[PDB]
Every structure is written in C-alpha cells, then in structure tokens.
Design a binder for this molecule. Structure first.
Ligand SMILES: CC(C)C[C@H](NC(=O)[C@H](Cc1ccccc1)NC(=O)c1cnccn1)B(O)O
Ligand SMILES: CC(C)C[C@H](NC(=O)[C@H](Cc1ccccc1)NC(=O)c1cnccn1)B(O)O
Ligand SMILES: CC(C)C[C@H](NC(=O)[C@H](Cc1ccccc1)NC(=O)c1cnccn1)B(O)O
Ligand SMILES: CC(C)C[C@H](NC(=O)[C@H](Cc1ccccc1)NC(=O)c1cnccn1)B(O)O
Ligand SMILES: CC(C)C[C@H](NC(=O)[C@H](Cc1ccccc1)NC(=O)c1cnccn1)B(O)O
Ligand SMILES: CC(C)C[C@H](NC(=O)[C@H](Cc1ccccc1)NC(=O)c1cnccn1)B(O)O
Ligand SMILES: CC(C)C[C@H](NC(=O)[C@H](Cc1ccccc1)NC(=O)c1cnccn1)B(O)O
Ligand SMILES: CC(C)C[C@H](NC(=O)[C@H](Cc1ccccc1)NC(=O)c1cnccn1)B(O)O
Ligand SMILES: CC(C)C[C@H](NC(=O)[C@H](Cc1ccccc1)NC(=O)c1cnccn1)B(O)O
Lengths: 178, 180, 180, 180, 180, 178, 178, 178, 178
C-alpha cells in the first residue's frame, strides 16, 4: 500500500497522522505509533497532523493520555479539519507547540452520543454523559486557558473557528506561515 | 363497473397474466355464462402476455367444456398461452383486430428449477409433454400439422392478425365497424 | 365518484401508465359506452406517460373498432403510446389543451431482454415491426408520410399542442372556454 | 366522507404530490364540477409539495379550461407545481391563508436521466421549454415580466402569503374569519 | 365507526403524524364542521408526534380561519407541530388531560438536504423563518415574549399539562370527570 | 499492487497524483506525500497531476495548506478533469508553474454541502457555509487574479473551462504543448 | 497478484493495458504508467493494448493528453473490443503506429451521460455536453482523417467497425497479420 | 496467494489457464501472459488449459487474436469444461496441437446477449449480432474443418460434445491418453 | 496468509488439498498444483486430501483428467467428508493407493443440477444430463469395481458410507489406522 508506505516513512521521521474519524481502532494505531516513537527517542518531538471529522471520546481519551504520558512533546498540527475529537486532541498538545495551518477549520461542540435501554440504564448513561461532558470541558479549559463556563456556553452547539480564531481562543499557539 | 356490465353482455376479458388465479376467474366467469344461457356465444376479449401452461390448459379445457361457443377476439397481443387460447375458440368465430399480435413458441420454465438429475429428467419430459400438447392443440385448432407447429413454435413465432388468419389461429379478421 | 359520473357523461380517462391492465380497463369502458349508445361521441381525456406497444395497439384497435367516434383530448402530456392513441381519435375531433405535451419516438424495450442471438434477432425484427406499425398509424392518422414519421420519431420528438396540430396529431386546439 | 361532502360544496383538495394520477383526479373533479354548474366558482384548496411539470400543465390547462372560475386557496405550502397552480386561479379570486408558503423555482428532473448526448440535448431543450413555459405562465398570471420570474425562479424563491400577494401569486390574503 | 360518530358530535382527532395528507384531512373536517354550524365549538383531540412545519401552519391557519372556536384537548402528547396546534386553539378553551406531554422545540429538517451553498443558504433562511414564525405563534398564543420562546424552544422543551398551563400552551387542565 | 507500485515509483520522481474524489483519506495521503517530498528535497518541484471529480473542502484545505507551507514549489497539472476541489488545488499551485494539459476540463462551482439538525444547528451551518464560500472565493480570486465578485458570479453554478479558457481566467499559467 | 505481476512485467517491456472500463482510477493508473515509461526512455514506443467497453471522457481526455504530450510514440493496439473511449484512445495513437488485431471490434458512438439538477443546471450541462461532443468529434476527425460531419453522422448512434472497416475509416493504420 | 503462486510458477513453464468465465479482465490477463511468453521465447509452445463456462465474444476475440498473432504455437487443452468462448478458444489453437482431456465436456452454441435502447439502437445491435455470429461461425468452420452451414445448424442451440465427439467434429486434434 | 503458506509448504511435500466445494476455480488451482508436481517429479506420489461437500462435475472432470494424465500415482485420502465430486475424485485415485481416514463420511448420489430455457433447450439439457450421469456412473463402476446398475440404484439418492463401508464398496483400498 502506498498510503501505509508514506505513513511509515513519515513515522520514521516522527510525523503521525490523525486522518480519519477517531474510532477505537485508529486510536489504538495512533497510541501504538506514539509509544513506538517514545521508545525510539523520548526527547524528540512527535508531530501529529490532525485532519479528523471527530469520533469517539474514549478513543480521544486514549490518544490524549498517550500524548501526555509519552516523554516527548506532542506538537499537534491542525490540518484542514479539526472537529470534536480532532480539536480536542489538537489542543491536547504541548503548550507553545500547538499549531494550526492558516486555513484549517476547527469545530468545538458538546460531546454527542446515544441513549438506550431501560429508564435506569438511560439514567446511568445520563450521569456518564454529564461526567464525560464536564471532563471534556474542563480539559478544553485547561488547554485553551478559557473559563469552563465559556467553554460550555460556546460548545453547547457547533462552534467554528478559523486559524486566527483558534489562535485567539487557545486551541493552538502559533499559525504556521511562510 | 364496465367489466360486470359487459359480463351481463356475455363478454369476458382475458386481460392479465395467465396464472392460476386469473385462470380460475376466467373459468368461473365461463361457467356462470354457461349456466345462464348455454346457447348464446361467450365473447372472450384476449389482451394477455400469457403465463403458465397448466393455467393455459385449464382455460382451454373450460372453453371447450362449456356448452356455449367461445368467440375469442384478440386485441393487442396473444403471446404464449393467450395465442393458444385464441386458437382454442369456436371454429369460424375466432377473431382478432388487425393490429393485434399472436406470439406462439414452445413453453418455457419461469426461472431455474433445481433438483436431482432424475427430477430434472422428469421435469424435462413434462415440459416436452407440454410442448407436444400445445402443438397438438394448435394443430387441431388451426388445421395445420403438428410438425409445422413444432418447427414454427421452436422459437418466438410472431404473427399479425392477417398472418394469424393465414396461419389458422383465427378464422376472421374483424374490420373497423365505425360508422364514420 | 367523479370517474363514474363522467363515465355516465361519456368521458374516459387515459390517465395512468399504458400497461395491459389499464389497456383492458380502457377497452372495457369503450365497449360499454359503445353498447350503450353507438352514435354519441366517446370523449377520452389523455394524460399518460405511455407504456407497452401491445397495450397501445390494443387501445388503438378498440378505439377504431367501436361504432362511437373517439374525441381524444390530450391534457398535460401524451407521451410515447399516448400520443399515438391521441392521433388515433376520430379525424376532425382530436383535441389538446394548449399547454399539453406530445412525445413521439420509436418504441423501446423496458430494460434488457436476454437470450440466444436468434431470439434476439426475432425480438429485433419484432420491435422493428412495432416501429413500422407506429409510423404507419401516425402516417394514416396525421396525414404525413411514414418516412417523415420515421425521421421524426427516430429520437424523442416533443411537440406542444400547436406543434402537434401543425404536425397532425390533433385537429383542433381547444381554447379556454371559461366564461370570465 | 369529508372530501365528498366538500365536493358537493364545490371544494377541491390539491393535497398530495402532483403526479399524473393526482392530476387526473383533480381534472376529473374539475370537469364534474364544470358539468354540474359552469357559473359557480370552483374552490381549490392547495397544500401540496408539487411534482412533475406535465401534471402541473395538465391541471393548469383544466383549471383555465373549465367554464367555472377557480378560487385557489393556498394552505401551508405551494411549492413548485402547486405555486404555479395557485397563480393559475381566476384573477381577483386567488387566496392564501397568512402562514402559507409559496415556493417558486425552475423545474428540475427527479434523479438522473441517462442516454446519448443527442437525447440529453433534447431533454435539456425540453426542460428549458418547461422553464420558459412556467415563467410565461407566472408572468401572465402575476402581472410581472418573464425576466423577473426567470431571475427569481433561478433558485428556490420562497415567499409567505403577503410576499406572494406583493409578488402577484395571489390577489388577496384571507383573514381569519373566526367569530371570536 | 367511532371517528364519524364523534364527527357528528363535533370532535376531530389529530392522532397521526402531521404530514400534508393528515393536514388536508384535518382541514377538510374543520371546513365541514364550519359549514355545518359556525357557532358550535369544534373539539380537536390531539395525540400526535408532529411532523412538517408547512402542514403545521396549514392546520393552524385553518383552525384560526373557521368561524367555529377550536377547543384543543391534548392527550398523551402534543409534540412539535401538535403542541403549536394545541396552543393555536381558542383562548380560554385550550385543554389538556393531566398526564399529557407538550414538546416544543425549533423546527428541524427530516434528514439531509443537499444542494449548492446558495440553495443551502436559502433553505437555512427558510428554516430560520420557520423558527421565527413558530416563536411568534407561540408568543401570540401563550402570552409570552418571542425571546423566551426562542430560548425555550432552542432545545427540546418538554412540559406536562400543568407545566404547559403555567407556560400558556393551554388555558385549563381538565380534571377527571368520572362519576365515581 | 501495480497502481501503488507505479505511484510510489513516480513519488520517487516527485510526481504525485490527485486521481480520485478528494476525501479526507486521499487528502491525508497526498499531504503525507508532500511532507515526505519536502523532507527529501525542499528545493525541487513537486508535480501534482490532478484528475479529480471534486470532494471535501476541509480535505482541499488540508491539501492546499500542505502545498503552500511546503518549501517546494508545487507545480499543479490539470489532467483531464479538475472539478470543484480539483480546480481549487490546481489553481493553488505556485504562480508561473500551474499548467493545464491541452484537453483538460476544469469545473469551478460554489461549494456544495448539506444542512441537518435543529434550526439553530442549521443556522450555525449556514454561517459556516457562508464563511467557507467566502474563503474559497477569496482564495480563487487570489489564484486567478480575478475580482472576488466575478469569482462568486461565475461559480454561482457549474462553470466550465477548457485549457485555453482556464489559462485566460487564471487557474493555470501555461498550456503544455509539444 | 498474478495479474498485477504480469502487468508490471509487461510494463518493464513498455506494454501497457487498457483492459477495463475507462474510469478515473484506471485512467490515472495508465497515465502514471505512461509518465514512468517516458521518464525511463523517451525514444522507445509505448504499446497500449486496448480491450475496453468505454468509460469516462474526462478519463479518456486525461489518457489522451498523457499519450500525446508523452515524448514516446504511443502505439495503440485494438485488442478484441474498442468501444467509445477505447476507440477514441486507440485512434489517439501516433499516425502510422495505430494497429488493430484482425478480429477486434471497434464501437464509435456519440458520448453518453446524464442530466440532473435544476433547469439552469441542466442547461449548463447541455452546453458542456455540446462542447464535449464537438471536441470528441473534431478529435476523431483529426485521427481518422474523415470530415467532422461524417464523424457526427456516423457516431450519432452505435457505429460498429471490424479490423478492415476501422482501417478504411482511419482509427488504425495497419492490421497486424502473420 | 497460493493460486496466483502456482499460476505464476506454471506461467514460468509456459502453461496458462483459462479457468473462469471469459470476461474482459481475465481476457487481458491471458493476453498479457501470452505476450510475455512470446517475448520470452517465440519458438516454444504455450499451453492453454481451458476450464471455462463461456463469457464475452470480444474477450474471446482478443484472446484469439493474441493466440494467432503470437509466434508461438498455442496448444489448447480442453480441461473439464469448454463452453462457448471456451470451445471457441480451444478450437482456436494450432492445428495438430489442439487437445481434449478424455472426459472434458465441450459446449458449442450460437453467441448470446441482450438488446436495449430505441428501435434504431436495437436494429444496429441486430446487425452487429448478425456479423458477430457469422464471424464466429466462419471461424469455427475454419477451426473444425466443417461447413459453416453445419456449424450454424448445430450451434443454433446448446450443442454438447465429449472428447471423442469433439475429436470427430474438429475442435481438437488428439485425445490425451496414458 | 497462513492457510496459503501451509498449503504451499505441503505442496512442496506433494500434499494437495481439496478442502472446499469443487467449483471451476478451485478445480483449476488443483489441476495447476497437479501439473506442477508432475513437472517437478513424475515418479513420486501426489497426496490429495479431500474434504469437500461436492461441487461441479465439469470441475470434477477436469480434476479427474489431470489426476489420470499426470504420470504420478494420485493417492487420494478421504478426510472427513467426501460428498459427490469429493467421493468421485477420491475413488478416481490410483488403485491400491486410495485411502479413507477411519471416520471420514463418503456421500455418493446422482449428479444434481438445473434446467432452464425453452423446451428444446431443456430437452438438450436432458440429453446432456443423461450422458453426464451415465459417464459418472460408468466411472464410479470402474473405480469401485461394482456393476453400473448397482451404482445407479445406490446413487439414485443420497447414499452414505463410513470408512469400512466405502472400503467394502470400492471407493478406497485401505483404511489408514495406527
Ligand atoms: C469529542 C467530543 C467533544 C465531540 C464528539 N464526540 C463524541 O461525542 C463521540 C460520539 C460518538 C462517536 C463515535 C461513535 C459513537 C459515538 N464520542 C463517543 O464515542 C461517545 C458518545 N457518547 C458517550 C461517550 N462517548 B465528536 O465525535 O463530534
Ligand atoms: C407457450 C405456451 C404453451 C404457454 C407458455 N407457458 C410457459 O412457458 C410457462 C412459463 C410461465 C410463464 C409465466 C408464468 C408462469 C409460468 N411454463 C409453465 O408453466 C411450465 C410449467 N411446468 C413445466 C414447464 N413449463 B407461455 O408463458 O410462453
Ligand atoms: C413509442 C410508442 C409507440 C410506445 C412506447 N412503448 C414502448 O417503448 C414499449 C416499452 C415500454 C416503454 C415505456 C414504458 C413501458 C413499456 N415497447 C414494448 O412494449 C415492446 C415490446 N416488445 C418489443 C418491443 N417493445 B412508449 O412507452 O415509449
Ligand atoms: C417548478 C415547477 C414548474 C414544477 C416542478 N416540477 C418539476 O421539477 C418536475 C420534476 C418533478 C419534481 C418533483 C416530483 C416529481 C417530478 N418536472 C418534470 O416533470 C420534468 C419532466 N421532464 C423534464 C423536465 N422536468 B416542481 O416539482 O419543483
Ligand atoms: C417544531 C415544530 C414547529 C414542528 C416540527 N416540524 C419540523 O421541524 C418539520 C420537519 C419534520 C419533522 C418531523 C416530521 C416531518 C417533518 N419542518 C419542516 O417541514 C421544514 C421544511 N422545510 C424546512 C425546514 N423545516 B416538529 O416535527 O418537531
Ligand atoms: C471546492 C468547492 C469550491 C466546490 C466543491 N465543494 C463541495 O461541494 C464539497 C462537497 C462535499 C464533499 C464531501 C462531503 C460533503 C460535501 N463541500 C464540502 O466538502 C463541504 C460541505 N459543507 C461543509 C464543508 N465542506 B467540491 O469540493 O466538490
Ligand atoms: C468516446 C466517447 C465519445 C464515447 C463514450 N462516452 C461516453 O458515453 C461517456 C460515458 C460515461 C462514463 C462514465 C460516467 C458517465 C458517462 N461520457 C462521459 O464520460 C461524460 C458524460 N457526461 C459528461 C462528461 N463525460 B465512452 O466514453 O463510453
Ligand atoms: C462462443 C460464442 C459463439 C458463444 C457464447 N457467446 C455469448 O453468448 C456471449 C455471452 C456474453 C458474455 C458477456 C456479456 C454478454 C454476453 N456473448 C457476447 O459476449 C456478446 C453479446 N452481445 C454482443 C457481443 N458479444 B459464449 O461466449 O458464452
Ligand atoms: C458426483 C457428482 C456427480 C454429484 C454432485 N455433482 C453434481 O451433480 C453437480 C452439482 C452442481 C455443482 C455446481 C453447480 C451446479 C451443480 N452438477 C454439475 O456440476 C452439473 C450439473 N449439470 C450439468 C453439468 N454439471 B455433487 O456436487 O453433490
């Protein structure tokens, strides 16, 4: 495969890609790449280019934990689209090393999901969704430096940002320009 | 309803695919018209793409069985089973309007029938008996020999109303009797 | 019911796809209206996208066969088979409201018909006979030559009511007779 | 049944998708009401998402053709064929309740129509003729120029009842005549 | 039939999904009851999950348009369009049994509507006009301000019968009038 | 795979291909190829042959940002079809190095998409679609040198160009002829 | 894969195959093979055996432009079936080097397609289809040496040619016989 | 793949296989194998084992032309089933080198297909089907040495042959027996 | 693939497997393996382990002819299931070298199939099915040493055999026991 070939060739250069919807499989692939790059060299930056339409939070939680616990500083790059888990994993990068390409579009919105089962099961899912939303909003407030109330009021629905708007909000720290 | 109104006028419509349900409807109509008046001629208008051979033979048997004569008037098309039913009418009273179609070919199976080779041999002998019975019916109704019917219905033999009259499927071409 | 009420007013609606079932309904209505009064003109309102050629020829044969004249009034669209049936009306009494459509082209097969090359050759000769019969009907009903119909119905020839009157499909454009 | 009860009250419901079947039902109802009393105004309540252009022109031709005036009252929405049929009513008697919708845009093809480039060119010229005929109908019924209709119906032009009255689709907004 | 028996008792059932067909049935029933007696109050029992906004506005316009007062009694659920229609009743005669539901939120599109960005902008402005019209209707019928309706119907605002009476959707909670 | 083999062999010669609909996966493959070619040699041209029926803007935005920020001068080649994001990425090449093959067909139309959700969600999608359309039209005006009003009036619907028509409009700079 | 293996082994011998319906993917594969063979040796012939039931014009336009602009002389070989874009790309070969196998069947007919959208969109598609048909017919007149009016009158519907009939018309220049 | 592996290992021994329905893809694979074997050694026999339920005539025409135009003598081997295009390509082998395994079943019948489109299109397809049937029957008469009228009368429907029956008719020249 | 790997490793040891339904593709794979093993060494036994639920006769005819015409003695091994074409190809092995594993189940029944088409086509299919059934029954009588009438009376329907029952009937010659 040509795509896997160029992906492994850029993995040898410590450049990983979040190029699809963040499901558990792609998440475990990204965490395996991060763990491999941390085992190779724990002092060199891991470049994570994110072009993702979102995905699972659990998956995003796994990628985020692998990003922070790896001794390398994870430099995230908003490439075109960062929505939901993309933006969350983009802002999850190291402070001072989170970048957005000058025409990337960043979509921050409340976690979305589904309820099913009996009334007690849906109530339990409600407690879990509330805890998930509070954790995601507290983490986004930690990343962007914004208050958690502004995070929740803005991510109540689909909230869009350009490169400069995300730089002003706090998802990224610089805008790569030549 | 026009169908019931023409049913009081002794007119039956063979207008759908010839399956067992349409066959039983046609047989019930024929038996009712026979019980009503066994001397008055039952008019059967035929615009049908045909269907199964067993329903074909059922309608043919009921048309020959009723005491009333069967004036079969073909309109548009009488393919497969409807052409044999059109020839199955009373001799001298088989009609077709000039732009009607008459499609006569050997009976075929609708799809694939699976099974062991003995069951396939039985089904093949049965469809050969169907072909021979259709050829015998067309030979006894059109005046031709069964071998000529066998070569002609080997493939799709398509005739007009005039061509069916020269072939013997009908005995008269019905002119347009419009007053103007 | 408005359809039955206009059926007592001698009005038939060719308003659905022209298949064998709709063909037999139209033929039953025409035969009932002919048995009722063979002198009063049968009005046939035509808003149909057409269909099979055999049902087309069945309805044409029944319209020419009934003793009553057929005033075919095209509304909206007389496409494929309904345009030939619209031209199949009584000469001098073929009407169409000014924004109606008349689509005349050569008959086509609905999908793919498989088989051996001899059966495909037979089906091709049959659809060529269908094309020639449609061209002959339109030539005898519109006053044109069959070759002009052959070049025109080579592809989708689409005409308005005025264009169909100059073409000969209808004999009169019906004005809006609203009192206001 | 409420539909038949209002049909005795001279009220027609254009309440479904405007296809050939609904078109023929509306035309049959209009012709029955015209044969009953050609002076009393036929009320047509219009709550429809539209449909084909040929059925649109059929209903328009039948509404203009009947001797009775057509009071078209739009309820809820008159998109596509409906809005042109709503403007197709008798001038001075075109109504719409204040929260009704009027969606006017150029006619489109429902899906993809395949074929050779000559057939595609013919279909394109035909849909251009449809667009021009719809623009001419709306220009003759709303008092505007066909070019203004062409720019406005280039995309989905959506109007309220007041906006349709200023546009000319209706001649009066009907107030709520509740006694309380 | 119980529906017709209660229709003679001036009772209408808004019991299915509010689409154009159910809208036209409700409008026909309302117009029949208005033509019968324009002073007697039309009872509309509402157990519906809602539907389109255009059918919603059609039923609302017809309820406000008829000379008879509309006593809307919500049973089970008056959700989406059915809730706005419940508030659309005559002031002082809007009822709901104590365990009924009232779901008010902004109108949404059933699925995905594709097209160019100008057509998407037009559809977005149209659904914004739908949201504003629903908020204006609920503000004029519940006594609240349109901004409070805008924040409340931003998401699924679900109320009981008492909560809808304090909200203003209904004017009275109907007690259980069982004799025992 | 033979197709992947010849694609990697032309990638070794710095010739990449946008040969399908521009979705996020093909976009990340193209950006990985661009990043690899920039890491190999940042002074040699990257030839991007575009035969695409369009696709996602986000994907096109990612490819465009990777093209510009790449030190290499991205020479785009309109090959047969350049529709929507194909023409956007074709005109996104370096000025003086954007080419069209003499029988390529270039389609420039307003971005297309879909609205869903509640009325506030569709209104938010309307703001986002307006910003996306304004950004795409400003970028096409930057590429072709045409005014943005002419860009919006022409790309209101499907706007077709031949090789010479696109050379006159400004999507490409030369027409390759032998 | 055995098929890809023999395809690459014949690509090493400069023999490419148009063996399926001409869609954009197979077209980009063929253009990549042509560009690779031109980069290897620009003076040796590229043999393109065409067994195709037709396909896309934009795809055929891309293959045709890659064939002409290729320094190498593209020797086309009508192998069994050359329909629509197969015959267009067969006649697109170098003059004097277009061949037909003695029992190949060549089908030339007006381009086909579909019309969708609003009336203005279908009118725009009508202008584009007219330009496409005129360009294809002018190119077929350039290839076969026939007048464009004869091309349009013959390709109004399905027009069939044998090997000798296509040699007389001008799609090929010789009939390979042993 | 094991099947592709043994196929390439027998291709190295100049043994090719027509083991499926003869469509355009398998036909181009077989023609590529024939061209490769002719480029390797033009004096050694190419063994084509045919176990095919039929397929496309064009595909069969392409395979046949590649068989006769390759300088090698194509020894065909009826292996189990040779129906339609299988028997046509089996009898297409070199005279004196066409073989049938002692229990192969050979099915010769008139070409089959379908008619579609308008009446002029179906008439054109009728001329093309008549020319195709006449060419196939003349070629089968050339192969078997039988008159063309006997070929057409026998292949009017499904005509079955065993090994000895096909040896007597002329599809093969010897029956391999040990 | 692990399955293809162990299959090729046992093919190097001259052990082939009929492990699925006997269709034309698996049949051509098995005949290619037999031809390869005969080209490698024509004096060593080819072990064919058969675990098959039946399949095509033509396919079975091809496999059978390849088994007999290969100079190697084909030792068949009834492994678990030998139904229909499995038992036909199991009994098709060399006399004295046909084996059944002690718990294999062997199913011999009349050939099955399907009729379609017109009455003449179904009659032709009837002649062909009769010839096929007579040939299969004569071959099974040749293998098992039983009279052909007993073969036809037993294989009129599904006829089941254990290892000892098939040894007594004649499908195999020994029962492998340790
Ligand atoms: C990252 C957050 C803040 C935003 C969105 N994420 C989610 O809510 C997604 C929704 C989703 C994705 C894939 C499969 C099923 C459900 N995350 C989840 O998987 C999820 C959903 N509900 C509860 C817990 N996790 B994103 O995917 O749009
Ligand atoms: C040719 C005359 C005798 C009648 C033809 N009948 C058949 O071919 C029909 C096929 C058919 C078609 C439509 C629906 C059901 C069945 N043949 C049979 O019914 C049939 C039944 N058993 C064995 C063999 N044939 B007609 O349908 O072509
Ligand atoms: C052109 C005039 C004469 C009539 C046309 N009829 C046909 O093309 C019809 C097919 C059709 C088309 C549309 C809808 C349903 C069926 N032709 C046939 O029925 C037919 C039948 N056998 C051989 C050839 N054609 B019309 O439907 O286009
Ligand atoms: C715009 C006015 C004039 C009427 C519109 N009609 C059409 O677009 C309709 C298509 C349609 C739409 C919805 C449902 C069914 C069919 N136009 C046609 O029927 C039609 C037919 N042939 C060529 C071109 N258009 B309406 O549906 O938008
Ligand atoms: C919210 C109130 C005002 C009415 C709601 N209806 C809508 O949102 C409906 C959609 C719908 C919902 C359910 C079933 C069928 C159709 N709105 C529309 O019909 C509509 C139409 N065009 C643009 C935007 N909305 B209800 O169904 O939630
Ligand atoms: C390049 C622009 C100007 C023109 C065309 N744009 C679009 O129509 C594309 C088509 C598309 C592709 C995949 C998924 C959804 C939509 N639009 C988008 O990608 C899109 C749509 N809505 C929001 C953001 N992006 B092209 O990309 O087809
Ligand atoms: C050589 C040419 C003139 C003859 C034939 N051309 C066409 O019919 C092809 C058929 C096709 C293939 C794929 C997708 C859509 C349509 N036409 C086109 O490619 C086409 C159609 N509309 C616009 C642009 N191109 B062939 O390519 O099938
Ligand atoms: C050898 C010949 C004479 C006999 C048989 N020929 C055919 O029936 C084949 C069957 C087939 C295969 C694929 C697609 C369509 C049709 N006919 C053709 O290939 C065919 C059909 N119509 C026009 C041109 N060729 B065989 O190929 O099954
Ligand atoms: C020993 C053999 C004869 C017993 C069974 N074999 C057959 O009869 C097989 C069953 C089968 C398999 C695949 C597709 C169609 C039919 N028959 C044939 O292959 C067959 C059927 N009709 C004509 C020629 N061959 B076995 O597969 O159950």
């Amino acid at each position: 495969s040509l795509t896997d070939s160029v992906y492994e060739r850029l993995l040898s250069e410590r450049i990983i890609f979040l190029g699809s919807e963040v499901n558990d499989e792609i998440a475990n692939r990204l965490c395996a790449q991060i763990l491999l790059l941390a085992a190779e060299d724990a002092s060199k930056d891991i470049s994570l280019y994110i072009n993702s339409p979102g995905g699972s939070i659990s998956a995003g939680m796994a990628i985020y934990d692998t990003m922070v616990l790896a001794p390398c500083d994870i430099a995230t790059y908003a490439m075109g689209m960062a929505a939901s888990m993309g933006e969350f994993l983009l802002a999850a990068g190291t402070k001072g090393k989170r970048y957005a390409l000058p025409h990337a579009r960043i979509l921050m919105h409340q976690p979305l999901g589904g309820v099913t089962g009996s009334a007690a099961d849906i109530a339990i899912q409600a407690e879990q969704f509330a805890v998930i939303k509070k954790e995601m909003f507290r983490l986004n407030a930690e990343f962007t430096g914004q208050p958690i109330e502004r995070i929740e009021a803005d991510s109540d629905r689909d909230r869009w940002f350009t490169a400069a708007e995300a730089l002003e909000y706090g998802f990224v720290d610089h805008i790569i320009t030549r | 309803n026009p169908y019931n109104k023409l049913f009081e006028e002794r007119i039956i419509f063979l207008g759908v695919q010839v399956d067992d349900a349409s066959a039983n409807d046609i047989m019930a109509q024929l038996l009712v018209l026979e019980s009503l008046d066994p001397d008055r001629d039952i008019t059967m208008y035929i615009n049908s793409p045909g269907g199964g051979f067993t329903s074909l033979m059922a309608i043919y048997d009921t048309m020959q069985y009723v005491r009333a004569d069967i004036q079969t008037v073909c309109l548009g098309q009488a393919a497969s089973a409807a052409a044999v039913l059109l020839a199955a009418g009373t001799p001298g009273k088989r009609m077709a309007l000039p732009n009607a179609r008459v499609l006569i070919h050997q009976p075929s199976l609708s799809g694939v029938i699976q099974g062991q080779f003995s069951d396939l041999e039985i089904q093949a002998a049965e469809i050969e008996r169907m072909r021979t019975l259709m050829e015998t019916t067309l030979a006894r109704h059109t005046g031709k020999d069964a071998g000529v019917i066998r070569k002609d219905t080997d493939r799709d033999k398509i005739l007009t109303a005039e061509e069916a009259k020269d072939y013997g499927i009908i005995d008269t071409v019905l002119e347009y009797r419009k007053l103007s």
